[PDB]
Amino acid sequence: AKNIMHGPPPFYPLEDGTAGEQLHKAMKRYAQVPGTIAFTDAHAEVNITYSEYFEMACRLAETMKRYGLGLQHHIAVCSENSLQFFMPVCGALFIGVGVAPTNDIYNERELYNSLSISQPTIVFCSKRALQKILGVQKKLPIIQKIVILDSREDYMGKQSMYSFIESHLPAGFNEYDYIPDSFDRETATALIMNSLPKGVELTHKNICVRFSHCRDPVFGNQIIPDTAILTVIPFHHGFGMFTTLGYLTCGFRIVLMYRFEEELFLRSLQDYKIQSALLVPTLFSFFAKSTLVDKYDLSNLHEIASGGAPLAKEVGEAVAKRFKLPGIRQGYGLTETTSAIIITPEGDDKPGACGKVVPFFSAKIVDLDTGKTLGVNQRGELCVKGPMIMKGYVNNPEATSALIDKDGWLHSGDIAYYDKDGHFFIV
Prior knowledge:
The protein is an alpha/beta fold and 427 residues long.
């Protein structure tokens, strides 16, 4: 009883409504302030405002509604990180259509398996990803429609977003009149992520709880205007999807790169006055080697995070030293937990620790051959319970039961311990 660690109350009370309603409300606010940048392409230098994004998200939402999609349908987004990636994501969330972010680097065999699990009716893909999508469509009849993301005109006989929108939208559609669908957030499929890989069913409730964390001044980022983040995390990764979505609710500027480059990354950090940089685990190792860092003005940079990805103590300290920072904004989480359920609290950084338990969550350490709850400073298997835990693996209840027990505890498999202050450490 005294050995179960619980997250504190959330700074703000949990917001009502679905993930789509919650996202629509925020984006609508930032839409009405002209020039508020949602996304920036570091390669192309193109900026897209929240007003452009809100309009496109609302238009795609209604278009998919009139096309015939509802709660029983899914869509796939298969692209490299781009300005248009989140347009179908936001649009589908508004109407309760489950989104399946699909790895654009997948081979034909892996792509089939992923799409086979999520069974999408419409696939939104980039020009680069089209050839593989056409191949898999021949094997999967469920895919009835392919829409091109990064094209203004029609591409290879396939409709662009704009042309697809025109085919279904009423003559005088007003995005500020648009109202997102209301449904049971506890059960409704929001996203289907890939963890032979499995499909992870994440509910609207799952994302609603993440939306609480990301706007939390302790466990996320405080909503301060003119705040920009640079992310090189693939948007189909859990750590890339649920950080970026959260940044949209905060009204932040999200600077992106479809490909990593050392100089472009560091110049983007400097010129866009980035306050938060997000790396994948192996890019942390890269920047421990990088020496160019000193040549750039990174005085605006406040933190470096992964989004909950595993990071070794020594590598974390070396990166922090390069960027002249006290430490890394660490986190622990799995795809099956939506996002990070153990996060470094703002300013409360501790060497080695991956943070404290997030609001609404509980964490315990157990014996590996008993399941007995262990105490402070004692090493064992890390188990978590909270409303961000997935609904289950898609069409695989046996793998779900092996991971999540009847009390709602998820068994991560990782060895951990917590100290007397509540900080967790991955061994």
